[PDB]
Symmetry: D2
Subunit: 121 residues, 4 copies
């Protein structure tokens, strides 16, 4: 509950997601041209605690579509926090395909927060 919808991060990328009754996340991630749209899939806790805790979840986008392939994939891990203004707070890992000699620089890390409203600025 509450997860399905369109979400926007602080840099205005758009995460359109559906949360299925089974725990599945499915949808699209973009930033508005078709060439910038990618499939996403993930999982979320479909029976969260009832004590005030958020709902754990995660998803992946591989950065290949019909138009572009960056040979890389990002995973977001986080929790949905419901209520007045719902947010999803995440930290993410992007791994690029590398040779073994370059594997030490394969993975970037950062954090994104998503709300159902587009950001200002």
């Amino acid at each position: 509950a509450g997860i399905t919808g369109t979400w926007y991060n602080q840099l205005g990328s758009t995460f359109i997601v559906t949360a299925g009754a089974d725990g599945a996340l499915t949808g699209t991630y973009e930033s508005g041209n078709a060439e910038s749209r990618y499939v996403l899939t993930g999982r979320y806790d479909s029976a969260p605690a009832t004590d005030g805790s958020g709902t754990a979840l995660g998803w992946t986008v591989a950065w290949k579509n019909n138009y572009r392939n960056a040979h890389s994939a990002t995973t977001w891990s986080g929790q949905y926090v419901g209520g007045a203004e719902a947010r999803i707070n995440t930290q993410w890992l992007x791994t690029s395909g590398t040779t073994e000699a370059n594997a030490w620089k394969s993975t970037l890390v950062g954090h994104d927060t998503f709300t159902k409203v587009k950001p200002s600025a």
Copy 2:
């Protein structure tokens, strides 16, 4: 592609995955049915053939019909083919927390998977 099949991490877990032609990863992660969980993810279905690995990632939410830890792990990494084939990953586990505890919500670590047991 080389990803579909059974993989083992270095600490007794088994990752059973099918890599679909559409770039999907689907499968299960275990350890016994009480210890088994659905996973889903995505991978680069057209990687480079220049010696670079194949990027990928997937998620397990730690709920099944028996147990629920109210947490989810994501793995981000690359498959490296060859005679000693491996999937090398870094992972983040986020637990559901209150706002006050959100600073201790996420563990980070790494896992290497191989096609034969440890």
Copy 3:
């Protein structure tokens, strides 16, 4: 030349740290969760003392081991980040906290997160 880093920084959760940025690249100071002694710990780290002039941030990092004369949590946090100058100067960081664990519990030894520090006590 002024690095702009020396002084008192606050995150959005209470915590305060007081740092000196030495001419040799050193960061030295204290980190405190209110300001009582039992909440104060030694900080040490390093920063780039000749950053780029193209508008990029100044890379830096520091460590606090969570032991003082009063308490010992058997853990240490590192913050890795960059200072961004201006009227609203900020240090944006990602941090890792590692707790000492047995080998069996080593998978749950390290937490990760992010914090942003400003010069304005919130």
Copy 4:
């Protein structure tokens, strides 16, 4: 021995460290990869009174990648623990942040993991 000594990671970097009585780590880091040549200063902290229940010893340190030869405008922190034994090891995860503009801040930080032994691998 303990933490003080010369350690090597899996990629052949050399970490020369002294663990002081007061919890200080000091020494030099020499990296086999990246925009890096010769030694760089490191400083950090460690738990100088660890648990006696078989846990490892929490520690962390930072290198800013500027020395008299090269400046990569970046810094790495390592957070981890020392695990004594027959083959003593320091297991860490690390974050490198590069100075970036605001537009590029999303790609400022790499993450990885290093394990160090007192014996050098090939």
